[PDB]
Amino acid sequence: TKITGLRTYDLRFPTSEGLDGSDAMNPDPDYSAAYVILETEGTHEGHGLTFTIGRGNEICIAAIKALGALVVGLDLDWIREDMGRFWRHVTGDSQLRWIGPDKGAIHLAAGAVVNAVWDLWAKDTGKPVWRLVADMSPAEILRLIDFRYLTDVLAPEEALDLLKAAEPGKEERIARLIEEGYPCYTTSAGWLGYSDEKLRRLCREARAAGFTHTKFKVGRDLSDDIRRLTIAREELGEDMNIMIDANQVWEVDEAIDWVNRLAFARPLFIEEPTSPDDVLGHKAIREGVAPIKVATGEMCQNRIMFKQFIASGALDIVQIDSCRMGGLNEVLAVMLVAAKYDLPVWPHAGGVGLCEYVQHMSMIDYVAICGEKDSKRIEYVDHLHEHFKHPCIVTGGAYQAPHAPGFSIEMKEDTLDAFLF
């Protein structure tokens, strides 16, 4: 098996029509995917994407094509033999690095390409990605990871120790995952553009469906936020766990004041109270709003930023995203850093296929990394699943473990045509 070529698709979805996805920073996102297919001589092709919200998708497409120079011609076996090495290779063109390094368009693109390789690998061995990785030995998992710029906080040796400690009880955890699935929260009732009436109805739906955790957007208007959360609490009941998300809009002092004003709602955490680059700022906010926790990560650019968020105690909840960074391999590195510091990972999802991606990632985290899932929640959003050949399945507040070979991200063929920008 050789990667013999690649195709790209600038796919954009009219989510702004009903303001699905709307928040304090992004009032009218058009959920989009910079989509890549890695060609082989064989029966399988590697599908992958990275998520954007409309304009700018074509920049990610440009970056994917640039990265293709590094991937077309590779033997899949050379990749599998040491994927950490492949990861260094694909993020290691010094000239392409200049455009980053490991941030912005070039890293979004790497997420798509790297995950497409995983899709191909999984399809070839006949396993869903979560099982492909979960079945690996500690050394095999360790080999997937490029540790460059991590070693002062988590060196390979300490990562290997964590992996070995998790190894006993994988089989039992795999069985448990099959029986129970992995718990998730819903953001579906929370988009900032929704009318109060729509908020009420969707809160009731979320409660009826069996979700125990629900997330709501805040951050544009304090009066609106107080009203909305009061209404949300009314419909949801006192037992429901509520979280809130400001989407980066606040200054540090502003964040502290505003969150504390929403304390009556008993939010578990505030997500992204400020810029996703501001480690020290998140830490300041964290101290100022305790016992309300702080979550961030959906735009955290790479493992180097995550390691500083985690090591400095700037956050309570680590929200990795499946394709913001360099795909699965870098996510795994961050999950290991989080495990060292005993911080829970609650992945960002929704978007286009992000649920499809992160379901696998958390399941690896549960089976082979930290061994705990019950107190955690993967994000879930009920948008755009009809475009996927193997959509995530969620019922009673939990993702069912994927069965199909691959990374669950492959779209129906018609979608690749109808939504081409």
Ligand X SMILES: O=C(NO)[C@H](O)[C@H](O)CO
Question: Which parts are annotated binding residues for Mg(2+)?
Answer: 245, 271, 298
Q: Of 260 and 312, which has the nearer Cβ to its own copies?
A: 312
- Which residues have a Cβ under 8 Å from the Cβ of 408 and sit 6 or more positions away? 128, 129, 353, 356, 357, 359, 360, 388, 390, 391, 392, 402
Give residue for tokens 């959920």. 31
Q: Could you tell me the end-to-end alpha-carbon distance of the chain, in angstroms, rounded to an integer? A: 32
Angle subtended at Cα 326 by Cα 416 and Cα 128, rounded to the nearest 5 degrees: 60
Task: Say whether residue 253 binds its own copies (CB under 8 A).
Answer: yes
Q: Does 159 bind its own copies (CB under 8 A)?
A: no
Shorter beta-carbon distance to ligand X: residue 182 or 269: 269
Q: Is 21 in the site for ligand X (CB under 6 A)?
A: yes
Residues 6+ apart with CB under 8 A from 46: 3, 37, 38, 40, 116, 117, 118, 119, 120, 121, 123
Binding positions for ligand X, 381-420, rule CB under 6 A: none
Best CA proximity match to 409, nearest among 111, 73, 191: 111
Is 404 among the residues that bind its own copies (CB under 8 A)? no
CB-wise, 91 or 187, nearer to ligand X?
187
Catalytic residue selected from 348, 360, 383, 387? 348
Q: Minimal distance in Å, beta carbon 10 to ligand X?
A: 19
Q: CB–CB of 248/240 below 8 Å?
A: no
- 393 lines the binding site for its own copies (CB under 8 A): no
Here's the x/- map for its own copies, 28-67, by CB under 8 A: it reads as xxx---------------------xxxxx-xxx-xx--x-
β-pair type (182-186, 46-52): unpaired
Contact 109, 66 (CB under 8 A): yes
Q: Among 78-86, 87-95, 112-120, 261-269, which window interacts with its own copies (CB under 8 A)?
A: 87-95
Does residue 108 interact with its own copies by CB under 8 A? yes
Catalytic site residue from 217, 307, 340, 360? 217
**How many Å apart are CA 403 and CA 178, to the nearest integer?**
10
23 binds ligand X (CB under 6 A): yes
- Is 389 catalytic? The answer is no
Q: Which does 52 bind (CB under 5 to 8 A by kind): its own copies, ligand X, Mg ion, none?
A: its own copies
Report if residue 29 touches ligand X, rule: CB under 6 A.
yes
Q: Residues 305, 279: contact at Cβ < 8 Å? A: yes
- In the chain, the amino acid numbered 296 is T
Q: Are 193 and 382 in contact (CB under 8 A)?
A: no
Closest contact distance (angstroms) between CB of 319 and ligand X is: 8
**Is there a catalytic annotation at residue 170?**
no
In sequence order, the 6+-apart residues with CB closer than 8 A to the CB of 21 are 15, 29, 31, 53, 191, 350, 351, 383
Going by their DSSP bridges, the two strands 3-12 and 32-40 should be labelled as: antiparallel
**Nearest to its own copies of 102, 316 (CB atom):** 102
Give the catalytic positions in this structure: 217, 348
Residues that bind its own copies (CB under 8 A): 25-30, 52-56, 58-60, 62-63, 66, 69, 93-108, 148-149, 151-152, 248, 251-253, 274-281, 284, 299, 301-302, 304-305, 307-308, 311-312
Residues that bind ligand X (CB under 6 A): 21, 23, 26, 29, 187, 245, 247, 298, 348, 350
